[PDB]
Amino acid sequence: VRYCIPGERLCNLEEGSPGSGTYTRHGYIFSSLAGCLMKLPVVSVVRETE
Template sequence: MAPPVRYCIPSERLCNLEEGSPRSSTYTQHGYIFSSLAGCLTKTSENGVLPVYTSFSCPGDIVLAKVISLGDTQSNYLLSTAENELGLVVAHSESGVQMVPISWCEMQCPKTHTKEFRKVARV
């Protein structure tokens, strides 16, 4: 069974610095790690050290998602990318180049060859 998905919004406190390591799409302040983007939160471990926290998408990305709830009175929407044809469609690397999908969970910059783990839509 897959672990539950946790979504986060910009400026949401994710954990304290003793519990994890910040990466792209996060920032630190007053001893805590905060999200700088909205999206799915992933928690991974590198070489047995503290978990690494990252978000799902970046500003300017195009994500294909399904509305699963219209939310509350604040006009919030709950989106899902849980199907194969849903997920990231267009992304740009830090160097400004459009990335290409290399698997269902990875995008690569053709200029720098850096890879980013993302949930890629099968379109």
């Protein structure tokens, strides 16, 4: 388990697909919320309440 901040990158496009609460730059998937991540996987970062 790990919590993540919006600025830091997660993985490349070959290792994962942008599913929810993230965004995609050239060669990278960056998180876009403050919370924990869950996861050709679909990785997405959410917060515990909603």
